[PDB]
Amino acid sequence: KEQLASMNAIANVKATYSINGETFQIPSSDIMSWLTYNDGKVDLDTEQVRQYVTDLGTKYNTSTNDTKFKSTKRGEVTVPVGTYSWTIQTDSETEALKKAILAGQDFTRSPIVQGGTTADHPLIEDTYIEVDLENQHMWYYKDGKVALETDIVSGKPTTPTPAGVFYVWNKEEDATLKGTNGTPYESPVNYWMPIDWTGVGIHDSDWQPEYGGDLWKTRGSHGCINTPPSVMKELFGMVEKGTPVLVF
Ligand SMILES: [Zn+2]
Numbered sequence: 001k002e003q004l005a006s007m008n009a010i011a012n013v014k015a016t017y018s019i020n021g022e023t024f025q026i027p028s029s030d031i032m033s034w035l036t037y038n039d040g041k042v043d044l045d046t047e048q049v050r051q052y053v054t055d056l057g058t059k060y061n062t063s064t065n066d067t068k069f070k071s072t073k074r075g076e077v078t079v080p081v082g083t084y085s086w087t088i089q090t091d092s093e094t095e096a097l098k099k100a101i102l103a104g105q106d107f108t109r110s111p112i113v114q115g116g117t118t119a120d121h122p123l124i125e126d127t128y129i130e131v132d133l134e135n136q137h138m139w140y141y142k143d144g145k146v147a148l149e150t151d152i153v154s155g156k157p158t159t160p161t162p163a164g165v166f167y168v169w170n171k172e173e174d175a176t177l178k179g180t181n182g183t184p185y186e187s188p189v190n191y192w193m194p195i196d197w198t199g200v201g202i203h204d205s206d207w208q209p210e211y212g213g214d215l216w217k218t219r220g221s222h223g224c225i226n227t228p229p230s231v232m233k234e235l236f237g238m239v240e241k242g243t244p245v246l247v248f
Contacts, residue, residue, distance in 0.1 A: 006042045007035060009104035015097075016108040019060045020120030024205070026052075031101060044101060050094040056111065057088040062123045063115065067165050069246050072130060072139055077248045082164025083197055084123070085116030100111060116167055116242070123165065128244040129202070129235075131225055136212050138202075138225065140235060147238060150231040151212025153205060156220025166195035166245040168202075171236065177203070179222050190229065192237040195245040200224055204232035220237075 015026040030052065034044040058064065069079045073153040092112040101246050110120035117123070128146040131137075131152065139149040154161035175192035179185055179199060187207065201224040205211070205226030208219065227235065227246075 003037075003040075003042050006104065007037070010042065010044075010101055011035060011069065013101055014106040016106070017056070018108055018110045019119050020062065022060075026101075034101075042102065044098045046094065049098050049101075050090065053088060053090050053093045053097060055110075056087065056093070057090060060119070061085070061087050062119075062165070063087040067246075067248065068124055069124060069130075069165075071132065071248065072138075073132060073135055077135050079246045080164045081234070082166040082247070083169070083195070084116045084165050084167035084244050086117060086119055086123075087114040088113050088119070106214075116169075124244055124246070127188065128246060129168070129241075131161070131188075131245065131247040133163065133215075133248060136214075136216060138227065140239065141209070145220045148231065148235055150228055152191055152228075153208055153211050153219065153226040154221060155200075155216065155223040156246055157217055159220070160224045161200060161221070161223050161225060161247060162196070163248045164196075166200075166247060168192050168193045168195055168239060168241055168243045168245060171239075171241055173236075177222075177224070181222075185222070191232050193236065193239065193248075197224075202227055202232070204229040 011032050017024055032046045036043045036045045066081055067079045068076055071077050088111045096112055113119050127142050130139040133154055136151055138152045140147050172192040174190060176186060176188045189203040192203050200223045202225045206229050208226050211228055
């Protein structure tokens with residue numbers, strides 16, 4: 001029949017993926033090798049398509065692939081996987097991909113994912129909080145320009161601030177952190193910005209006379225990023241929820 005016109009159509013389909021800011025086309029050769037025919041219907045070897053999506057996941061998932069970050073004082077460095085990420089839902093994507101390809105019309109798409117944001121754009125744009133552990137300094141960029149910066153005091157050597165791609169998932173005022181040392185601690189805080197799932201976050205360090213330098217090795221935090229009370233207030237007021245926070 002003319003289901004040939006069909007099979008020829010999907011063989012020429014330009015399938016374009018947009019993932020983490022990168023664009024590429026699915027090679028025609030892969031499409032042709034997926035092209036199958038059964039039950040009198042033109043189709044795609046779902047097993048092969050699923051392997052391809054499983055590969056997209058392993059190659060691009062920001063949940064299992066570190067992020068290249070353009071730091072302020074060191075050029076491009078690698079920031080480990082953090083809490084701010086996404087994962088391609090294999091079965092949903094495979095089905096959506098097949099449907100798209102079988103339709104036989106050129107298309108561009110970003111994968112179906114689960115996480116803190118979709119994959120139709122780069123994980124890190126030009127708005128984020130940068131926490132340089134080596135320099136014990138913090139920057140807040142808004143649309144590509146520093147909107148505020150300041151020295152900070154990260155966690156002490158025993159309870160180090162973990163590196164990774166995090167994000168401000170919540171904002172609380174007059175909160176009260178709690179942890180151990182043993183011997184629990186309280187230490188109330190005027191502004192709390194959790195960026196982790198383990199207690200780590202940004203907050204005013206009222207009880208800290210000096211920030212920056214090597215302070216953390218002496219009077220280091222329990223993991224949080226201690227911030228000068230006055231700065232923290234201005235930060236909190238301008239940092240929107242969902243803002244990425246890179247710690248390296
Ligand atoms: Zn603390």
